[PDB]
Amino acid sequence: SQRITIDPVTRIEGHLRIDCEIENGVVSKAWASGTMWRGMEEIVKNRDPRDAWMIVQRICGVCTTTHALSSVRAAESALNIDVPVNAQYIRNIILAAHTTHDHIVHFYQLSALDWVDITSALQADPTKASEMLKGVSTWHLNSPEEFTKVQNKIKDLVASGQLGIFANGYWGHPAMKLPPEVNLIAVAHYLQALECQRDANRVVALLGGKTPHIQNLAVGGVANPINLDGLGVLNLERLMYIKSFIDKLSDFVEQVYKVDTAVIAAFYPEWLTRGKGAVNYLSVPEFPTDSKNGSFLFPGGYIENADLSSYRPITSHSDEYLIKGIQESAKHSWYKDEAPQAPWEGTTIPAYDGWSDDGKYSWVKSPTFYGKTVEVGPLANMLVKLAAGRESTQNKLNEIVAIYQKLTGNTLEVAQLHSTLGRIIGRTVHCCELQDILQNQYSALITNIGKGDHTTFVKPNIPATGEFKGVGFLEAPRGMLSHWMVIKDGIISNYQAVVPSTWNSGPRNFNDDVGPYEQSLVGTPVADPNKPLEVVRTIHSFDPCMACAVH
Amino acid sequence: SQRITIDPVTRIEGHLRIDCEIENGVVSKAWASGTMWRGMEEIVKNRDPRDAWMIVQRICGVCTTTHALSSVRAAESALNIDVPVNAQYIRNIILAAHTTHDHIVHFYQLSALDWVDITSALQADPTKASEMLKGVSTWHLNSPEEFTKVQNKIKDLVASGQLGIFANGYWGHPAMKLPPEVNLIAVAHYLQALECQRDANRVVALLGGKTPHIQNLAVGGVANPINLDGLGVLNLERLMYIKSFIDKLSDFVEQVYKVDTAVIAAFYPEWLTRGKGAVNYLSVPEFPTDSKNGSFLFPGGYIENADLSSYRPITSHSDEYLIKGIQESAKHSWYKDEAPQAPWEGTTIPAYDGWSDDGKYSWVKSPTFYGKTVEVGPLANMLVKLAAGRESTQNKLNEIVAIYQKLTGNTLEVAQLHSTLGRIIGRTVHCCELQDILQNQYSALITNIGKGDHTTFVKPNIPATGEFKGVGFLEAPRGMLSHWMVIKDGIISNYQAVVPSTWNSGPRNFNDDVGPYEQSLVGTPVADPNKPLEVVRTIHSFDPCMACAVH
Amino acid sequence: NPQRPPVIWIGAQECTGCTESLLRATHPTVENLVLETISLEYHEVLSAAFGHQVEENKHNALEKYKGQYVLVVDGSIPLKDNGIYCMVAGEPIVDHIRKAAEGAAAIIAIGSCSAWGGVAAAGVNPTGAVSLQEVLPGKTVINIPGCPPNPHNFLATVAHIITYGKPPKLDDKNRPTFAYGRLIHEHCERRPHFDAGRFAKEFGDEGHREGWCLYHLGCKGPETYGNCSTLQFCDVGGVWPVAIGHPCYGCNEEGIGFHKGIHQLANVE
Amino acid sequence: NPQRPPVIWIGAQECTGCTESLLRATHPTVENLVLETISLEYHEVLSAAFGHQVEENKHNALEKYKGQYVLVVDGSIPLKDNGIYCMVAGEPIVDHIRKAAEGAAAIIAIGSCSAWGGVAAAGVNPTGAVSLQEVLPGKTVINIPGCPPNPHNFLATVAHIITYGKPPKLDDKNRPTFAYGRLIHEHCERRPHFDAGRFAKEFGDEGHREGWCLYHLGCKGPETYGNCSTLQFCDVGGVWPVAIGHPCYGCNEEGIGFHKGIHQLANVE
Numbered sequence A, B: 001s002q003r004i005t006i007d008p009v010t011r012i013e014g015h016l017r018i019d020c021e022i023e024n025g026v027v028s029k030a031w032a033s034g035t036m037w038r039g040m041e042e043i044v045k046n047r048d049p050r051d052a053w054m055i056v057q058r059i060c061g062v063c064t065t066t067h068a069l070s071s072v073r074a075a076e077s078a079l080n081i082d083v084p085v086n087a088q089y090i091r092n093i094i095l096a097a098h099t100t101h102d103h104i105v106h107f108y109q110l111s112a113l114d115w116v117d118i119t120s121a122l123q124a125d126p127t128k129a130s131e132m133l134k135g136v137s138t139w140h141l142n143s144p145e146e147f148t149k150v151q152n153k154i155k156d157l158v159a160s161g162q163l164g165i166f167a168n169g170y171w172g173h174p175a176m177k178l179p180p181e182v183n184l185i186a187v188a189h190y191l192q193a194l195e196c197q198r199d200a201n202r203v204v205a206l207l208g209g210k211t212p213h214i215q216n217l218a219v220g221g222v223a224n225p226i227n228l229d230g231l232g233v234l235n236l237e238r239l240m241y242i243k244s245f246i247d248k249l250s251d252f253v254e255q256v257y258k259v260d261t262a263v264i265a266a267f268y269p270e271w272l273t274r275g276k277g278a279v280n281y282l283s284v285p286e287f288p289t290d291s292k293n294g295s296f297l298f299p300g301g302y303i304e305n306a307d308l309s310s311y312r313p314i315t316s317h318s319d320e321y322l323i324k325g326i327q328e329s330a331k332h333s334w335y336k337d338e339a340p341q342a343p344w345e346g347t348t349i350p351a352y353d354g355w356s357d358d359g360k361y362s363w364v365k366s367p368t369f370y371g372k373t374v375e376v377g378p379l380a381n382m383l384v385k386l387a388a389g390r391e392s393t394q395n396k397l398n399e400i401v402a403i404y405q406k407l408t409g410n411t412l413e414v415a416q417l418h419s420t421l422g423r424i425i426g427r428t429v430h431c432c433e434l435q436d437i438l439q440n441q442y443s444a445l446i447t448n449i450g451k452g453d454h455t456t457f458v459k460p461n462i463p464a465t466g467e468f469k470g471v472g473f474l475e476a477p478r479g480m481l482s483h484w485m486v487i488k489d490g491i492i493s494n495y496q497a498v499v500p501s502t503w504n505s506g507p508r509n510f511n512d513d514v515g516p517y518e519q520s521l522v523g524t525p526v527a528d529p530n531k532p533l534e535v536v537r538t539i540h541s542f543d544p545c546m547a548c549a550v551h
Numbered sequence C, D: 001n002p003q004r005p006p007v008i009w010i011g012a013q014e015c016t017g018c019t020e021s022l023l024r025a026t027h028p029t030v031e032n033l034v035l036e037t038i039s040l041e042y043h044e045v046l047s048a049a050f051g052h053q054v055e056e057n058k059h060n061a062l063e064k065y066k067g068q069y070v071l072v073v074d075g076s077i078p079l080k081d082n083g084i085y086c087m088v089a090g091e092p093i094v095d096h097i098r099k100a101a102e103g104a105a106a107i108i109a110i111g112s113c114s115a116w117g118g119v120a121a122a123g124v125n126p127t128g129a130v131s132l133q134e135v136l137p138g139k140t141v142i143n144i145p146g147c148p149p150n151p152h153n154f155l156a157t158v159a160h161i162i163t164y165g166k167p168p169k170l171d172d173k174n175r176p177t178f179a180y181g182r183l184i185h186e187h188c189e190r191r192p193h194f195d196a197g198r199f200a201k202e203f204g205d206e207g208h209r210e211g212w213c214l215y216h217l218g219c220k221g222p223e224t225y226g227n228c229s230t231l232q233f234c235d236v237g238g239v240w241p242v243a244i245g246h247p248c249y250g251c252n253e254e255g256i257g258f259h260k261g262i263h264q265l266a267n268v269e
Ligand code: SF4
Pocket: B058, B061, B212, C013, C014, C015, C016, C017, C018, C074, C075, C076, C110, C111, C112, C113, C114, C118, C119, C146, C147, C148
């Protein structure tokens, strides 16, 4: 075989190394390695439970908001606090708007240059490019004039001899399949995406106090003061401003990102037949809307051996079957204790001894669910919604499939979603459905305030003795997140984060079973082992976040 | 034969009445009337000269900034103060950005519905509309998809049965000549204009402290504290923000407003042969760039009997020829003192006695220059620049003419500019050239601060005895503005504003000579005397502002 | 495609700056205001119709929407000499206003001129200009002062009427508390400098160039109710007169703006 | 189409929030930053190249632009166990940083992690995380703290280096004075409430819902240098933690953020 290393993997969050053995141009075995650790679990220990969320939010700034929200949910779980419904609406709007920005940036700024060749875009006929989209999109910024302006910006950059972020990209690689015209379309959309994601984060900022790293949470609810008639607080004028940004997201999401997802799939049909990482999938329900931390707008569940028809629904963040199943192992990770650990009893004891193919090779732990490897994130999330018979999800997928069918003459079956492109599709479906979440929760907030409920915060009490345990689940952009807090004598005695990229990127486990990234790469063709674009395509479909994975 | 009244004239600033005698289907005689007075000259009397600008800025909120700037320049004239060059750069940026907003809103929100039929736009083919602009514009928001979205908004408004500001418009009038497609183009641009004008006013706001009604001036300079390294003052971050908005204006101005101007001319070429208001024109130089209230970027001058070749240049705001020529009469105005008055000796004594065709019929005074009626504003301004041989103005006019030529196969000569459409063209040319003013003055400010000059303000002294006369000239969106201040014993003993719409809108003068509005209407064909659209088309071309005209 | 709440806007002795405030708004933008939020049944600055046609629109709308429309007035109303200082279609504006007021669901004075007389009623008051409340003594007039106010002080007042079916809470001058409930000086970011005696003495001086308090330049924040330091202006961030370097002039507040000199010192409570 | 000033960005123990701040920027936007303002010669979050290709880009840039590039680092640098807590291309990140620093025209620590250790160096400091300055004792590191800072605190620093040829004025922690020269509490719009003893006691209480001072909720404004109350965040107007209802946590300031509890009271000068 030949042995390659990809280090650093770029266009992810954080520090990733991927190694592959290649046999006759086909990946036979792979290793995923998170190469940076901070010890954020140990840093937060021995503090007041109320302080955790501000600290652990810094696990990641790409998936900002997520660890903050999981941490307060964990403390509320431990303390048995029911969050005020207004606090849930506000948390929900933040998470949905955040995730909109996140997914858009992943598709365009992080992933598009795996599939798109900017050199080829310079050869495009901008008018032919525009005409290709007639009857496929109603987006208002697909004109030949827009595309020519974009083409000229690329031309100018190439001409400068200072290619910067585009230098030494995979231009003319044999796995680049788009015609010039579609390459130019995608670059134009890449630039337009930046405005849409900016608007999404204006929503986040107006409730969170800023982004990155929101500052409006509390164990017990939120710090936003609801008062329609108050100066300097969350009044009707402020809410109207929030709404003005919510309303700006939908057109790009539906007429650009959704469409490009189908267009990419149409030109790369082999990528429906590789990059399967697992046969089990997990998601948690999300966006609670009652006064008791439930009544979620999105459903969760567990699929085993790819069988949607027999999946197990999860409708509560207190589900004992979900809680009891989760363990992590450090057999092949740089920690001391190797046997599977339930997170309330987890340790994180560093034991770096360098790279070994058969020993320890990552700072990521290996999570299992009742002993099995599981993929999390948008593929899981979409499949669970389909298994639930959620019509909104079916319908949205069907819209992507209809565009794909128009371009290719072919449909897509669910079997084909267990793939690199299926994973990308799941993420797009999520982004689309989140726009209805935003409308729904903004309307719910306005209605509730109108009824006279301005409550936002229930002040916790924390017993100064005794030992008690909580867990906060969250369906993050990259999948199921859980923070596990043990409180003893009023302070955090254990804190364990089990993060979605931990599930997907973790190394071989206690039984030497292979997790999603590593499994997904088996079978990948590598045309040029010096430039393994095909490996990076599949890895990027998981939206790696290694600050998240490792913490 | 018959007599009509148009009252109110809408889609102007303020309160205007126009009366016309119609004979053999053509206007034979017209009256222009300003029907509201406040007495702003009297309100500001007896105050400290330094206070005037904040009060008299409220002469007008459409041409906000202008009376504030004119007022400080008048006090500075009286007191012999040389304004710091940084204060000039800031004043200039404000005036240029304001005027960009002002002209855009005039062409679209105030004037386009004279020429554009929204009902006809509903019958357009959006694809044909887009195709019509190929090789005429490079604007990125002329797609069929953009135009379809716009058409659907019109459709929905009409379907609602609540037409609001579009209700009872001149839809189907025989003087409406655009094809459905061009109607739809115009309405799309109307909506797009609102974004561009908002960006222009963001420039104004960041230096003025808000708009409408800036709050950064002083007799002696400006209140902006320049400190690249200072927190909470005008630092490099703030300057970069200003620049980000300046840069957003050009494309719409050049690729939409400029082009639409040529398109309207191409479909309405008879409107190059009517609406001449005067044979004399006046403008003042504007945008001073030296340390002594001079070195203007735009030239000024006086044209008599339409002879550009023998015009008199005006290069100084202290030019005694300009100062000594200006008088106002109230013979046909509702004031007591009727003989021509130099503004330093002006009175404004109300003497309302109702309407008489041959007596008093307006709150607007009648200005003359050495006893002659004069047109001011963008037509004057453009013609003076052409007389000066300003290449930038020649070149910009030529661009408009080249589009007109491509559309019609005909050219435009300077003789055809003395017309309703010529006036409109002058305005467009001004807006275009102001974008280079903004780039020039931003760069000048950055450069000057870099040389270590952070000076912005020279504190005035005002002698407690003596009588001092000052005049502040400004080339406003609607033409030459002048504020005339007399200081006696430390306070304002006389204040007289002679405003551009005074020149143009003022009634018959001491010698019963006819001013621009009234002159311009003679010969106007009126197809339907009950719906005199053609009259309002010519009156709008002057961009009336009656709070300005009357004060 | 539902019906939208009707609005009648009448300008009296106005400078048009109150209408112009709408062109800076972002939530809603003026285009979304007129297409989505309201039906602007009469507004002389933007209406296609003129003359007889626009007076037709007004009469039709007053009848069609009797009891339902919001009436908005900018500018002062001049009573001297029997109303002749503002005449529209041959009749005193005070008559047009009183007629429209008869059938209004709500009445708003936008800007200091309609709210309390403003600059048009200052000094010797040449035209006998008065406020909208003064010409409508039997009606509750909602005052949104400022010259002009932040347009959202108006737009969120209208939105509260539409969305929740009543006006926002008002103070004892009938001003919405969300915008006018507090002195500017009781929520001003330069209060620390005031407290420490750190004051600009002249524009351009060292203190001014470090963003110190503008009290000694004449800041009227201590005697002006408003939201200028928090909501600020134009939605760009950091833009209000004091932040730019100039004292508050008190334009929101009767007896302050247009009465006191720029550099006259405020009373401090 | 001129040449643009080169930038090399290396991430150490970074959460990526400091890069992400750029995606909220408006002056310049991130797309104008990379196409117009600078040439971003190395940035692993955005670069098309990966692995051996991106390591080639770094080496080629370090040579081509020796003496000319701005080096930017986010995240802390872990010294414990000979650097192994952050390994890229098989080498400790401290070695990559020291190498890139040799040829830098200017060096910037963006964010509290690189400026003073930040969250990653808190508590027991599992990895022996330190600041950029600590690993480059012979260099003047410009510190732009915050978690993350407003991106224009960085962008205007870079623009000053480009436009005027030297760094902006710095305080004695090498922080740009335009952004960090004053305590938040010495320029906070809730100071009047502080002064009057008008305090929120709990989130959602009546004082909180009137926008009163957050001192008694643990606001660290009194002991944190920054521009959060004036520049604020995201350029929409009115948005910073305190304006949203939550105390400053002191994330800019060493020994405050990530050390003091949220609800622990600040010392007041
Ligand atoms: S309040 Fe001010 S802006 Fe409004 S009409 Fe009066 S003078 Fe004009």
